[PDB]
Amino acid sequence: SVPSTVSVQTREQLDRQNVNNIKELVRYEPGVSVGGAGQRAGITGYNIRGIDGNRILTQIDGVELPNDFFSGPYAQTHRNYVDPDIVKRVEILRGPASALYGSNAIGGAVSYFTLDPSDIIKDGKDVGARLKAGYESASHSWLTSATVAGRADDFDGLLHYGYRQGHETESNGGHGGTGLSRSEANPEDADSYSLLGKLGWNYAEGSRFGLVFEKYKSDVDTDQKSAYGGPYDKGKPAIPPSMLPGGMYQWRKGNDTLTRERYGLEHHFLLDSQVADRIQWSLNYQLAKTDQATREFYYPITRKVLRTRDTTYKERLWVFDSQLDKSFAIGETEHLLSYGINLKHQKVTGMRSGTGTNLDTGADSPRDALERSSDFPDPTVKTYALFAQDSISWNDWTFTPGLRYDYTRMEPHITDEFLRTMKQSQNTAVDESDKKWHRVSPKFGVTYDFAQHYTWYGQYAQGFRTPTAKALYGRFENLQAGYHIEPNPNLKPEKSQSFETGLRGKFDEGSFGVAVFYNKYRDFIDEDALNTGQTFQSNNIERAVIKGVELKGRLELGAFGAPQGLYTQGSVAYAYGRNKDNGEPINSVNPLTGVFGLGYDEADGNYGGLLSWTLVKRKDRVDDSTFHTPDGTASQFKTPGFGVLDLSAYYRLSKDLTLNAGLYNLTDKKYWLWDDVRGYDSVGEASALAPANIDRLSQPGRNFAVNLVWDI
Amino acid sequence: ISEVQLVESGGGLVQPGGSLRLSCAASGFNFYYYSIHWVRQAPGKGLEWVASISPYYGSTYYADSVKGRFTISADTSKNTAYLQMNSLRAEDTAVYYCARSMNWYYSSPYGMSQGMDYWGQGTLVTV
Amino acid sequence: DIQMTQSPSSLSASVGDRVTITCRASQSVSSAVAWYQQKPGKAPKLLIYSASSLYSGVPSRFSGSRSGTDFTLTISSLQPEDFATYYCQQGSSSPLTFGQGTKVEIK
Ligand SMILES: CCCCCCCCCCCCCC(=O)O[C@@H](CCCCCCCCCCC)CC(=O)O[C@H]1[C@@H](NC(=O)C[C@@H](CCCCCCCCCCC)OC(=O)CCCCCCCCCCC)[C@@H](OC[C@H]2O[C@@H](OP(=O)(O)O)[C@@H](NC(=O)C[C@H](O)CCCCCCCCCCC)[C@@H](OC(=O)C[C@H](O)CCCCCCCCCCC)[C@H]2O)O[C@H](CO[C@]2(C(=O)O)C[C@@H](O)[C@H](O)[C@H]([C@H](O)CO)O2)[C@H]1OP(=O)(O)O
Ligand code: HEM
């Protein structure tokens, strides 16, 4: 009924598919990819219809997740702050379709909704429990989670605790060792825990005031054996081992720590007024940060030193959200109006530092040390949003006009750490005034039902994302390698237009869905782009187009003659991106992907299973200038086509105990995902400092995942 | 402790207007990622930078006083730098030094490497 | 293009004295200024690089400083082996420019 493409996965579906990270969440979503395989920083984030990075609005309970951050080989943070084990559902929206979400959802939005006491407490009972134990063979990871919810008088409470402990996600390369000859995944030790607490008061009918507490800590100790013996030059060591045995990077060990703490208040109630029938608001405070610690034996020919690096990227967020719902009728049309405000107060800090100690004498090495440096002047970003949306029903038509006004103000704060960055480079030109942006983003959706089975829809939406502080103020000079990074204080915000139309058909014997989209991007921000020694500067791509077609379908085979419960389904996604400034393709566009399934479900749901077949085309349209091959050699690697088989099954051992099992990569095929390959080396610095054997970025071989869920 | 050893050769009495080739053999680490510089000192005068070669980028640089007449090249297989001097004048007589820059491609930018830390003994060219 | 004016051209100095050699640039330049010591009949030896950093093995008597377009080389306690000619060199990458040179003699 919604005039847009949105995919929802419930808590039960996540348990069925053994979803332990967002990479496994998008396994069978053909138009969404998650990268980061083989990278030190780990899982990067979502790629929706060729759009990834900070242009995807990732939020949990309305609170936006931190953006990416790259500041060299020892400073790289991704967007992996959410544990999928604490959500009741996840919604993937494509494009800035909704006015209720922020306009910075250029490529789409991924929304997480945490578990509520209602979905834990059984019907007819006042207390509930949920114990889960799971194992994943791909990363040798164990999961243990426990959730308890209760309902006493007019108060409801929920307490969730989960703990993960595992290792690195294995690749399908069969050679270990060190250097570029290592095709196995770098060893890792990953520990994670997540704490969720809710306490609500149901003081009236349709009214609830609640408290939310949330903590999440992820600790990964990595051994970058693939980087031993570096640096490398076009796939070969820069310094021959005959003269420097072991290279300049004798060994490199690291630790990445992710943290998210969130405290929130939410309130909704029913009102008898002419302005609204239902009002909800929430106030949240979130502290999310990433800590990268690097240790290495550094041997720059003349001296042996222990070189350490520390990087912290932190975001403190205050967000107030509101939404007032009013229902009324004007003549033959029924109206459903939703309006409100959204206030954001964001502080972003980034710090880099390092030390150097001589391994022969024990003395300090100032040449190998780094003082505390800030890449941006600790900005304070205030966002004010006003939105209104009306759902108008007239006969079989449904019109959804929308408006969202966004106001963004950024306040720089010059500190001594940032002044040091202005000293490292010879660029001391910084503007201490405030930068302001504002825009009205219209949105329109139309739905029409006909022939008792079909639905036509059209969607028009606009997106708006303001520049970040790193692009506006980041500066760095490398006289040794002959390049520098210039800030772009005149960078313009992104403007996008989304056009989408489609046809849906619902039957008792199955359903289908066809979608065609056309997205135009104006002033597409290309951070750290190489101009034309060398200059890296964030610039605006004036025009960019991404278009494609998505196909969905499901057939109930029992109606055509088959055992009841047997079904088949398919999902095919195609995209086409072009940079209209230079005519080059957009490398973030995934190849033609299709997922086909043959599944069975028992009549009472006691057991069932699904056989999945994923077919992906070979990548063809590649921009050679902006694509850096992971191995660094002259030849550029394009991912081939492949087909893989996966089998999921589920059995109810008891009325409370359910066993979910899944076998992946049945034929044990060595294959690559394009998003992992094209995203490994974003700027080209990794080709020399942390290269990847092409087999180390391959997907895991034959593996299984099993979990046991006890709903007491 | 001693990364490279630089030795110059090819210097001597060339009659004015003639040609002469100077070679700079390096013993030790290869200077493919470094910069090799030629510096000459006329008798009783100061140091004057004349040319430079960066093998990694393939870039060559020259002073105005020697532009067009001098050619600088490198081998990177013999670890030897060459300075082809043509149309020599009486003002070109000096002691030509071969020097290697401290800064190189993979040096840490926080190390602040700058200048030439290794020099040859020099060869006398008399025009 | 850029010029480095080094003053003085000669310093009469006594063992134990503190001497200062100043090098002034003709334009706006970065900190890429190096200092060299040359004795007669010998190749130049690098002492200070990046206008402040002491090269490994060079005695701590030598020191570098910067003030705008003026660069300073200082010897806190002159010693008998420090009587030579000193040159300031400007530039991180080519082209490079050397100073006129300052000869330090015995007072
Ligand atoms: C209105 C319209 C809506 C409909 C939708 C329209 C849009 C369509 C969307 C499409 C998405 C795009 C996909 C695509 O583009 O790629 C593919 C097309 C095939 C599909 C055609 C379309 C059908 C779609 C409808 C299906 C609905 C059910 C082609 C491809 O990508 O080939 C690559 C690849 N190729 C592959 O990786 C492998 C196969 C897939 C694996 C088979 C899985 C079995 C499916 C059962 C699933 C049912 C459950 C739902 O790729 C194929 O092409 C299979 C052919 C399928 C035919 C489709 C029609 C079937 C009829 C159904 C129609 C309705 C690989 O080829 C690998 C080959 O090597 C083997 O693997 P290896 O060991 O060597 O590693 C074999 N693979 C295997 O042996 C795997 C298994 O051991 C066999 C299967 C056993 C399971 C038994 C079934 C289980 C029970 C099922 C129950 C029902 C071979 O390949 C084979 O041997 C495969 C077999 O011969 C079987 C195939 C027929 C299956 C058809 C289903 C019928 C159902 C009944 C079955 C009982 C063979 O390829 O290397 C090549 C690359 O070559 C190099 C290179 O660099 O250039 C050199 C190479 O030499 C070297 O090795 C190197 C490396 O590979 C690097 O990867 O790569 C690749 O080619 P590339 O594109 O050029 O890059
Ligand atoms: C093709 C692109 C690039 C190449 C080849 C490159 C190369 C290098 C090299 C060789 C080093 C020294 C590493 C060491 O000594 O261990 C380095 C360091 C560094 N680079 Fe780059 N670089 C590139 C782009 C960038 C960009 C785009 C940025 C920032 C936006 C950046 C930021 C840094 C920083 C901060 C360091 C310091 C590392 C430290 O703390 O020691 N580089 N780079």
CSV table of N, CA and C in Angstrom, one decimal, chain A residues 34-105:
chain,number,residue,atom,x,y,z
A,34,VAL,N,26.5,-4.9,1.8
A,34,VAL,CA,27.3,-4.4,2.9
A,34,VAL,C,28.8,-4.8,2.6
A,35,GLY,N,29.7,-3.8,2.6
A,35,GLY,CA,31.1,-4.1,2.4
A,35,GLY,C,31.9,-4.2,3.6
A,36,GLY,N,33.2,-4.2,3.4
A,36,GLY,CA,34.2,-4.3,4.5
A,36,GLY,C,34.9,-5.6,4.7
A,37,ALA,N,34.7,-6.6,3.8
A,37,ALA,CA,35.4,-7.8,3.9
A,37,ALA,C,36.9,-7.6,3.7
A,38,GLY,N,37.7,-8.1,4.6
A,38,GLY,CA,39.2,-8.0,4.6
A,38,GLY,C,39.8,-6.7,5.0
A,39,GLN,N,38.9,-5.8,5.4
A,39,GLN,CA,39.4,-4.5,5.9
A,39,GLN,C,39.7,-4.5,7.4
A,40,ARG,N,40.7,-3.7,7.8
A,40,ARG,CA,41.0,-3.7,9.2
A,40,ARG,C,39.9,-3.1,10.1
A,41,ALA,N,39.2,-2.0,9.5
A,41,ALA,CA,38.2,-1.4,10.2
A,41,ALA,C,36.9,-2.2,10.3
A,42,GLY,N,36.8,-3.3,9.5
A,42,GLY,CA,35.6,-4.2,9.6
A,42,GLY,C,34.5,-3.8,8.6
A,43,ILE,N,33.3,-4.1,9.1
A,43,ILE,CA,32.1,-3.9,8.2
A,43,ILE,C,31.9,-2.4,8.0
A,44,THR,N,31.7,-2.0,6.8
A,44,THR,CA,31.6,-0.6,6.5
A,44,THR,C,30.1,-0.1,6.7
A,45,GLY,N,29.2,-0.6,6.0
A,45,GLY,CA,27.8,-0.1,6.1
A,45,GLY,C,27.0,-0.5,4.9
A,46,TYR,N,25.8,0.1,4.8
A,46,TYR,CA,24.8,-0.3,3.8
A,46,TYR,C,25.1,0.4,2.4
A,47,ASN,N,24.9,-0.3,1.4
A,47,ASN,CA,24.9,0.3,0.0
A,47,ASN,C,23.5,0.0,-0.6
A,48,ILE,N,22.7,1.0,-0.9
A,48,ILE,CA,21.4,0.9,-1.4
A,48,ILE,C,21.3,1.5,-2.8
A,49,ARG,N,21.1,0.7,-3.8
A,49,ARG,CA,21.0,1.1,-5.2
A,49,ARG,C,22.2,2.0,-5.6
A,50,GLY,N,23.4,1.5,-5.3
A,50,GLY,CA,24.6,2.2,-5.7
A,50,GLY,C,25.0,3.4,-4.8
A,51,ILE,N,24.2,3.7,-3.7
A,51,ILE,CA,24.5,4.7,-2.8
A,51,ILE,C,24.9,4.1,-1.5
A,52,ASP,N,26.1,4.5,-0.9
A,52,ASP,CA,26.6,4.0,0.3
A,52,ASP,C,27.2,5.1,1.1
A,53,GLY,N,28.0,4.7,2.2
A,53,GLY,CA,28.7,5.7,3.0
A,53,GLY,C,27.8,6.5,3.9
A,54,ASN,N,28.0,7.8,4.0
A,54,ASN,CA,27.3,8.7,4.8
A,54,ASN,C,26.0,9.2,4.2
A,55,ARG,N,25.7,8.8,2.9
A,55,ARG,CA,24.5,9.2,2.3
A,55,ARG,C,23.3,8.2,2.6
A,56,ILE,N,23.5,7.2,3.4
A,56,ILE,CA,22.5,6.3,3.9
A,56,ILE,C,22.1,6.7,5.3
A,57,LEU,N,20.9,7.0,5.5
A,57,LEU,CA,20.4,7.4,6.9
A,57,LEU,C,20.2,6.1,7.7
A,58,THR,N,21.2,5.8,8.6
A,58,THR,CA,21.1,4.7,9.5
A,58,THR,C,20.7,5.2,10.9
A,59,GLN,N,19.6,4.7,11.4
A,59,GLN,CA,19.1,5.2,12.7
A,59,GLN,C,18.5,4.0,13.5
A,60,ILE,N,18.5,4.1,14.8
A,60,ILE,CA,17.9,3.2,15.7
A,60,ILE,C,17.0,3.9,16.6
A,61,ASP,N,15.7,3.6,16.6
A,61,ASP,CA,14.6,4.4,17.3
A,61,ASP,C,14.7,5.9,17.0
A,62,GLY,N,15.0,6.2,15.8
A,62,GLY,CA,15.1,7.6,15.4
A,62,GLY,C,16.4,8.3,15.7
A,63,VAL,N,17.3,7.7,16.3
A,63,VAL,CA,18.6,8.3,16.6
A,63,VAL,C,19.6,7.9,15.6
A,64,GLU,N,20.2,8.9,14.9
A,64,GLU,CA,21.1,8.6,13.7
A,64,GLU,C,22.4,8.1,14.2
A,65,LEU,N,23.0,7.1,13.5
A,65,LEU,CA,24.3,6.5,13.7
A,65,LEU,C,25.4,7.4,13.2
A,66,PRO,N,26.6,7.3,13.7
A,66,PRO,CA,27.7,8.1,13.3
A,66,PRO,C,28.1,7.9,11.8
A,67,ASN,N,28.7,8.9,11.2
A,67,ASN,CA,29.2,8.8,9.9
A,67,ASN,C,30.6,8.1,9.8
A,68,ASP,N,31.0,7.8,8.6
A,68,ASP,CA,32.3,7.3,8.3
A,68,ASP,C,33.4,8.4,8.6
A,69,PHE,N,34.6,8.0,8.8
A,69,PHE,CA,35.7,8.9,9.0
A,69,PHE,C,37.0,8.2,8.6
A,70,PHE,N,37.7,8.9,7.6
A,70,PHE,CA,39.0,8.4,7.1
A,70,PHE,C,40.0,9.6,7.3
A,71,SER,N,41.1,9.3,8.0
A,71,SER,CA,42.1,10.3,8.2
A,71,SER,C,43.5,9.6,8.1
A,72,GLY,N,43.7,8.7,7.1
A,72,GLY,CA,44.9,8.1,6.9
A,72,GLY,C,44.9,6.6,7.2
A,73,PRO,N,46.1,6.0,7.1
A,73,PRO,CA,46.2,4.5,7.3
A,73,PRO,C,45.9,4.1,8.8
A,74,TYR,N,46.0,5.0,9.7
A,74,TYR,CA,45.8,4.7,11.1
A,74,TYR,C,44.5,5.4,11.7
A,75,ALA,N,43.7,5.8,10.8
A,75,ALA,CA,42.4,6.5,11.3
A,75,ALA,C,41.3,6.2,10.3
A,76,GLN,N,40.5,5.2,10.5
A,76,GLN,CA,39.5,4.8,9.6
A,76,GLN,C,38.4,4.2,10.4
A,77,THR,N,37.2,4.8,10.6
A,77,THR,CA,36.1,4.3,11.3
A,77,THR,C,34.9,4.1,10.3
A,78,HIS,N,34.1,3.1,10.6
A,78,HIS,CA,33.0,2.7,9.7
A,78,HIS,C,31.7,2.9,10.5
A,79,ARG,N,30.6,2.4,9.9
A,79,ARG,CA,29.3,2.6,10.5
A,79,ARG,C,28.7,1.2,10.9
A,80,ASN,N,29.1,0.6,12.0
A,80,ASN,CA,28.7,-0.7,12.5
A,80,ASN,C,28.4,-0.7,14.0
A,81,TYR,N,27.6,0.3,14.4
A,81,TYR,CA,27.3,0.5,15.8
A,81,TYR,C,26.1,-0.2,16.4
A,82,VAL,N,25.4,-1.0,15.6
A,82,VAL,CA,24.1,-1.6,16.0
A,82,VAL,C,24.3,-3.1,16.0
A,83,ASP,N,23.9,-3.7,17.1
A,83,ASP,CA,23.9,-5.2,17.2
A,83,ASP,C,22.5,-5.7,16.8
A,84,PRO,N,22.4,-6.5,15.7
A,84,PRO,CA,21.1,-6.9,15.2
A,84,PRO,C,20.3,-7.8,16.3
A,85,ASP,N,20.8,-8.1,17.4
A,85,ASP,CA,20.2,-9.0,18.4
A,85,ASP,C,19.3,-8.2,19.3
A,86,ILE,N,19.2,-6.9,19.2
A,86,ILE,CA,18.4,-6.1,20.1
A,86,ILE,C,17.2,-5.5,19.4
A,87,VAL,N,16.9,-5.7,18.2
A,87,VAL,CA,15.9,-5.1,17.4
A,87,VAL,C,14.7,-6.0,17.2
A,88,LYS,N,13.5,-5.4,17.3
A,88,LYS,CA,12.3,-6.1,17.0
A,88,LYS,C,12.0,-6.2,15.5
A,89,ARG,N,12.5,-5.2,14.7
A,89,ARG,CA,12.4,-5.3,13.3
A,89,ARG,C,13.4,-4.3,12.7
A,90,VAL,N,13.7,-4.5,11.4
A,90,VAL,CA,14.5,-3.5,10.7
A,90,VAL,C,13.8,-3.2,9.4
A,91,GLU,N,13.8,-1.9,9.0
A,91,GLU,CA,13.1,-1.5,7.8
A,91,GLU,C,14.2,-0.8,6.9
A,92,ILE,N,14.3,-1.3,5.7
A,92,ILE,CA,15.2,-0.7,4.7
A,92,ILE,C,14.3,0.0,3.7
A,93,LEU,N,14.4,1.4,3.7
A,93,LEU,CA,13.7,2.2,2.8
A,93,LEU,C,14.7,2.8,1.7
A,94,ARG,N,14.2,2.8,0.5
A,94,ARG,CA,15.0,3.2,-0.7
A,94,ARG,C,14.6,4.6,-1.1
A,95,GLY,N,15.6,5.5,-1.1
A,95,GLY,CA,15.3,6.9,-1.4
A,95,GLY,C,14.8,7.6,-0.3
A,96,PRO,N,14.8,9.0,-0.3
A,96,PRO,CA,14.2,9.8,0.7
A,96,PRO,C,12.7,9.9,0.6
A,97,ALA,N,12.0,8.8,0.5
A,97,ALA,CA,10.6,8.7,0.2
A,97,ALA,C,9.7,9.4,1.2
A,98,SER,N,10.0,9.2,2.5
A,98,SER,CA,9.2,9.7,3.6
A,98,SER,C,9.6,11.0,4.1
A,99,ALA,N,8.7,11.9,4.4
A,99,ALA,CA,8.9,13.2,5.0
A,99,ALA,C,9.1,13.1,6.5
A,100,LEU,N,8.8,11.9,7.1
A,100,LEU,CA,9.0,11.7,8.5
A,100,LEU,C,10.4,11.4,8.9
A,101,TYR,N,11.2,11.0,7.9
A,101,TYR,CA,12.7,10.8,8.0
A,101,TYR,C,13.4,12.0,7.5
A,102,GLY,N,14.7,12.1,8.0
A,102,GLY,CA,15.5,13.2,7.6
A,102,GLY,C,15.8,13.2,6.1
A,103,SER,N,16.0,14.4,5.6
A,103,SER,CA,16.3,14.6,4.2
A,103,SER,C,17.6,14.2,3.8
A,104,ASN,N,18.5,13.9,4.7
A,104,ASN,CA,19.9,13.4,4.4
A,104,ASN,C,19.9,11.9,4.0
A,105,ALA,N,18.7,11.3,3.8
A,105,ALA,CA,18.6,9.9,3.3
A,105,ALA,C,18.7,9.9,1.8
